[PDB]
């Protein structure tokens, strides 16, 4: 038997309650794995059974629920199950420049943009999914798309305006 434990934070319990159906139904139907949610230790527990094939699905299944722990939407992690080369890379905003106080919140606002649209635009440029924590940034996609999204984000918080990075990333996506 193979054991995977995925931790859940305190703020992720309610979206896990509201999205549990679309979490166990993809696993229990076509991945052939047993899943439960240990409330006593607060862990999503995944183990194999007698009806599992292609054991790497287990690994992807863990990454599946890991994405929903990190804040990603459900169907993106469904695409993580369906596709074969999808990865997530995370870094804090202060991991590339020392920002304090109101500067850090301004960096958060520059990543998100007004209405979220700037972040949304970068997604539609790079075919990736970007989730902002309080200070951490998580990018889900393939390797080169992760690199383009990470370069766009690192330019956005360097001080470059969202319009300039917007135009540059919308032009450089034709390669």
């Amino acid at each position: 038997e193979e054991t995977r434990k995925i931790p859940v934070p305190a703020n992720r319990y309610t979206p896990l309650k509201e999205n549990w159906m679309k979490i166990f139904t993809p696993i229990v139907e076509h991945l052939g794995l047993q899943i439960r949610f240990n409330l006593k230790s607060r862990n999503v527990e995944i183990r194999t059974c007698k009806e599992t094939k292609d054991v790497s699905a287990l690994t992807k299944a863990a990454d599946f629920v890991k994405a929903f722990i990190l804040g990603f939407q459900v169907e993106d992690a469904l695409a993580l199950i369906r596709l074969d080369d999808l990865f997530l890379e995370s870094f804090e905003i202060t991991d590339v420049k020392p920002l304090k106080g109101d500067h850090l919140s301004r960096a958060i606002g520059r990543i998100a943009g007004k209405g979220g649209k700037t972040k949304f635009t970068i997604e539609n440029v790079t075919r990736t999914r970007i989730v902002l924590a309080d200070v951490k940034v998580h990018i889900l996609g393939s390797f080169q798309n992760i690199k383009m999204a990470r370069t766009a984000i690192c330019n956005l918080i360097l001080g470059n305006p969202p319009s300039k990075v917007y135009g540059n990333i919308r032009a450089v996506a034709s390669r």
Binding site: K5, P7, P9, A10, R42
Partner: protein, 213 residues
């Protein structure tokens, strides 16, 4: 130009008698070629073994460091070296709207093993509480820390290694602290999060024998 792994051999590393699952695995040593012996390369090796592989029903977030220091013909003999919590559990325990209290004592046990104890505790929101945060004041924090230090001083210094380890297996000391600090500020997750081994006494073989059987 020639593989050293054929030249290697396998030894069996085993837990003390305080633990239910005793066979903790295998180790790969080279045979003695007359220059260096296998024992000298084997008498100092540290193993990071989780508690859930030592007891069938115990927790998984607790890890024990076991130092092997003897060989008995393909049977490594180990002893307590340290304790720690898994970093996933430590990251999960530090929630936001509360107070973190840490205490550490340098305590000498009954037979000379100088231990260092680190414990952590968190204030608990009451069942009827409407305030979002539960922040302990500074003097309350100092009182909780003082009681932590005195409880470990009165709890470890009077016992030997077998009793200390048998108390650390279910963390009875943390439960004692959580029960005792209830009249200062209610605490939430009290664990002895880290045990070090600063000073070991002179090497004895018999005490290892009652630690093993």
């Amino acid at each position: 130009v020639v593989d050293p792994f054929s030249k290697k051999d396998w030894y069996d590393v085993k837990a003390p008698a305080m633990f239910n699952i005793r066979n903790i695995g295998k180790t790969l040593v080279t045979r003695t070629q007359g220059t260096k012996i296998a024992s000298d390369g084997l008498k100092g090796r540290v193993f990071e073994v989780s508690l859930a592989d030592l007891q069938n029903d115990e927790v998984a977030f607790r890890k024990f460091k076991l130092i092997t220091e003897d060989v008995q013909g393909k049977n490594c003999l180990t002893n307590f070296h340290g304790m720690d919590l898994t970093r996933d559990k430590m990251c999960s325990m530090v929630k936001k709207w509360q107070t973190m209290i840490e205490a550490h004592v340098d305590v000498k046990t009954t037979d000379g093993y100088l231990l260092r104890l680190f414990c952590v505790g968190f204030t608990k929101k009451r069942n009827n509480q409407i305030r979002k945060t539960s922040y302990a004041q500074h003097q309350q924090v100092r009182q909780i820390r003082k009681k932590m230090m005195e409880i470990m001083t009165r709890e470890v210094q009077t016992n030997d290694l077998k009793e200390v380890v048998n108390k650390l297996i279910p963390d009875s000391i943390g439960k004692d602290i959580e029960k005792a600090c209830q009249s200062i500020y209610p605490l939430h997750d009290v664990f002895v999060r880290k045990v070090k081994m600063l000073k070991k006494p002179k090497f004895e073989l018999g005490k290892l024998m009652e630690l093993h059987g």
